């Protein structure tokens, strides 16, 4: 892996250092329907006029971004996503801005969020959860080797593609950092205790969040839940975790090592790095290269009926995409 990652870093750094800009414009697409939303962004299925291809267009209102103090995070999101390349990371096809909004146009991943399948089916069997987990382990090995921390792992940000494999989306909190950082950001159920306790933290928070993800996939509910975030933070900080009766002993052992409040003990954070996870008994049946190569049979393949089908996505209320005749926040977003 060390040879592959070295070359991967060279490729990434060229793009990190000279990012792509302004590679499309709004009137090149017809907007069709909203696919999903987050706290201040909307992603729409669109059709590109000259190619006929569909894409997923993330639209951010620049004034909302500034009001919520997310300028730096948004510049991070686009600078990093345009620079990465890995089989389980969604591809950014175009980006541009206009007087009012920022646009990130990705490949459309039609199989829907992992979230919706997970809630509907209830939970995933351990082989099913393990197939998805292995892809995240490989993706975090890749991202961390570029000095990137991802910081927002959750089923709502994981899309299932037409072959049943994962595409990670939402680089909103991704950040290139050597050593520690302090921003309180993420999703409450997925936050590592060191984030909540404000002491400064590093890429080990992504391995914690992997533990949450695996738990939630295999249990059908998170290891720490409640009706309000403060109550969740209390449970995370207690760190007490209880497991469903049906979890295997191997899964329980892995999760105690990922949901480890002690950073000198947390898997992914030790001397052997990601190999403590890759070599754990729960992953004994996983062929790590075949996963990378996408040669493993997926446990589940969402129905797909045609270019532009959105039936694997919930419906959303639509709103006008307004573009003012006055430029908003031009200086702030110059490099976008």
């Amino acid at each position: 892996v060390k040879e592959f990652l070295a070359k991967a870093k060279e490729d990434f750094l060229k793009k990190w250092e000279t990012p792509s800009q302004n590679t499309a414009q709004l009137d090149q697409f017809d907007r069709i329907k909203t696919l999903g939303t987050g706290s201040f962004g909307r992603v729409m299925l669109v059709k590109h006029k000259e190619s006929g291809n569909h894409y997923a267009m993330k639209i951010l209102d620049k004034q909302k971004v500034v009001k919520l103090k997310q300028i730096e995070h948004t510049l991070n999101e686009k600078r990093i996503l345009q620079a990465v390349n890995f089989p389980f990371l969604v591809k950014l096809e175009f980006s541009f801005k206009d007087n009012s909004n920022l646009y990130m146009v990705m490949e459309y991943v039609a199989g829907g969020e992992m979230f919706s399948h997970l809630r509907r089916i209830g939970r995933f069997s351990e082989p099913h959860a393990r197939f998805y987990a292995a892809q995240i382990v490989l993706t975090f090995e890749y991202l961390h080797s570029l000095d990137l921390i991802y910081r927002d792992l959750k089923p709502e940000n994981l899309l299932i593609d037409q072959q049943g494999y994962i595409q990670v989306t939402d680089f909103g909190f991704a950040k290139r950092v050597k050593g520690r950082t302090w921003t309180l950001c993420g999703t409450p159920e997925y936050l590592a205790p060191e984030i909540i306790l404000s002491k400064g933290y590093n890429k080990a928070v992504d391995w914690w969040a992997l533990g949450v993800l695996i738990y939630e996939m295999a249990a059908g509910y998170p290891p720490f839940f409640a009706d309000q975030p403060i109550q969740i933070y209390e449970k995370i900080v207690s760190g007490k975790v209880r497991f469903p009766s049906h979890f295997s002993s191997d899964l329980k052992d892995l999760l105690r090592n990922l949901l480890q409040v002690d950073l000198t003990k947390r898997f992914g954070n030790l001397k052997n790095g990601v190999n403590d996870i890759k070599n754990h008994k729960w992953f004994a049946t996983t062929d790590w290269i075949a996963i990378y190569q996408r040669k493993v049979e997926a446990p589940f393949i969402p129905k797909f009926k045609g270019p532009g089908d959105t039936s694997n996505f919930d419906d959303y209320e639509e709103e006008e995409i307004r573009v003012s005749i006055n430029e908003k926040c031009g200086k702030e977003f110059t490099e976008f």
């Binding site: 927002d152 999703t187 009706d227």
Partner: peptide
């Protein structure tokens, strides 16, 4: 059951990010 307690709670739908 833990399942029943989760399903009756108010955080079973899509979760938004926080960023403070």
């Amino acid at each position: 059951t833990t399942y029943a307690d989760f399903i009756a709670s108010g955080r079973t739908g899509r979760r938004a990010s926080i960023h403070d």
